Each structure stands twice: as structure tokens, then as C-alpha cells.
């Protein structure tokens, strides 16, 4: 049982703690330096009206986050979003990641986006199989795109497509 809701500035210290754990312990994230809560708050405020940012509360505690942002800052990409999801390392494999992402994707689809792209640092079987279970299709892979944790790691692109006409209408904000 998890309350899926919109992320607030008060959730960011907890979100920052979760993601920092994977930055240090895993190559799932290509950052090599932990983040501070305010950097997270800055991205949220800048993106939450235009892209969905969701947290999952469990027993009053933040147990995961799923958020979206722009793929690239050029206008033709405006209908292309990038998605991300992180679950606390003690609440994994309980369905929170899929529940968060399902809510994220329905918002993105209702808003009028064309597609959603996921950038997965490989290897990462849990994230690959979750994304492919929710309809993401493999699209590409850059070889040795990053050096983290003493090795070169490929990065893969997964994409989930929605149906839009020609021309597409400007996408709706979250509200």
C-alpha cells in the first residue's frame, strides 16, 4: 500500500538520500558525486508544472520517486520527454516502481506527449525488464559511453511511443 502523489519541496531531502545511495553503490546513475537536496528542489520547481513529478509515500515515509523532464532543449523535441524512477533499496520488488511509472506515463500520455525516452546505464536487468514490461521498446545503445566504478559501461535507449496527429497540439501542463 503506497500513496502516489505529486512531489513537494519537503520530499526532496528524502529523494536525494535515495538517489545518492545508487550514485555511490551502483552504475545505474552516471553521476560520480552525491547531490544536495536544494539541487533536487531546483529541478522540481522548474519542471513540475510541465512534467509530472511523483513520490510514493509508505507508512508516512518517502519510498520512491518517478519524474520526467525534457529530452533536449530544441523546440522540435518539445513532445519528447525523458523519464526516471528510483525506489528505496528496502522497498524494492514490491511494485512501487511499476505503480509510480504507470501513473507517470498516464499523465504524460494525457498531456499530449509523443514519446517517453529512458536512458539506462548498463548493465541493469531490473530497470530493463521493468521498462520493457510497461511497453518501452529498445531503440539504441552507445558503447563505453561512460567510465564509472573502474569500468566502461554502455548506455541504452528505451522509448515508449504515443499516437499524435500531424500537426501535434502543444502539450498540456500537469495541472
Ligand X SMILES: CCCCCCCCCO[C@@H]1O[C@H](CO)[C@@H](O)[C@H](O)[C@H]1O
**For residue 97, which of 119, 73, 128 has the smallest C-alpha distance?**
128
**Closest CB to ligand PPQ among 30 and 162?**
30
Q: Please, which of residues 93-132 interact with ligand PPQ by CB under 6 A? A: 118-121
DSSP 8-state secondary structure symbol assigned to residue 76:
G
| Residue 58 near ligand PPQ by CB under 6 A | no
The partner residues of 83 in beta bridges, in order of sequence, read 68
Burial (CB count within 10 angstroms: exposed 0-12, middle 13-18, buried 19+), residue 65:
buried
User: Exposure string (b/e) for 100-130, b if CB count within 10 Å is 16 or more?
Assistant: bbebbbebbeebebbbbbbebbbebeebbeb
155 is in an annotated binding site: no
Q: Name the segment binding ligand X (CB under 6 A); options: 74-82, 102-110, 122-130, 134-142.
A: 74-82
Shortest Å distance, C-beta 82 to ligand PPQ: 7
85 is in an annotated binding site: yes
| Residue 151 near ligand X by CB under 6 A | no
* C-alpha 72, offset from chain centre: 15
Q: Please, which of residues 84-103 interact with ligand X by CB under 6 A? A: none
Which residues make up each annotated binding site for acetyl-CoA? Answer: 85-87, 93-98, 124
Q: Which chain residues interact with a second copy by CB under 8 A? A: 27, 29-33, 71-72, 74-80, 114-115, 117, 121, 139-148, 150-153, 157, 159, 161, 166-168
Amino acid at each position: 500500500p503506497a500513496d502516489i502523489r505529486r512531489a513537494t519541496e519537503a520530499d526532496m531531502p528524502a529523494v536525494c538520500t535515495i538517489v545518492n545511495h545508487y550514485i555511490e553503490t551502483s552504475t545505474v546513475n552516471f553521476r560520480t558525486e552525491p547531490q544536495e537536496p536544494q539541487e533536487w528542489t531546483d529541478d522540481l520547481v522548474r519542471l513540475r508544472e510541465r512534467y509530472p513529478w511523483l513520490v510514493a509515500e509508505v507508512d508516512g515515509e518517502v519510498a520512491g520517486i518517478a519524474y520526467a523532464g525534457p529530452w533536449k532543449a530544441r523546440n522540435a523535441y518539445d513532445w519528447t520527454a525523458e523519464s526516471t524512477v528510483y525506489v528505496s533499496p528496502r522497498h524494492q520488488r514490491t511494485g512501487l516502481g511499476s505503480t509510480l511509472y504507470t501513473h507517470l506515463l498516464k499523465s504524460l500520455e494525457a498531456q499530449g506527449f509523443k514519446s517517453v525516452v529512458a536512458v539506462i546505464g548498463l548493465p541493469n536487468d531490473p530497470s530493463v525488464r521493468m521498462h520493457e514490461a510497461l511497453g518501452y521498446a529498445p531503440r539504441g545503445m552507445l558503447r563505453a559511453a561512460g567510465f564509472k566504478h573502474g569500468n566502461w559501461h554502455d548506455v541504452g535507449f528505451w522509448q515508449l511511443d504515443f499516437s499524435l496527429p500531424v500537426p501535434p497540439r502543444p502539450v498540456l501542463p500537469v495541472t
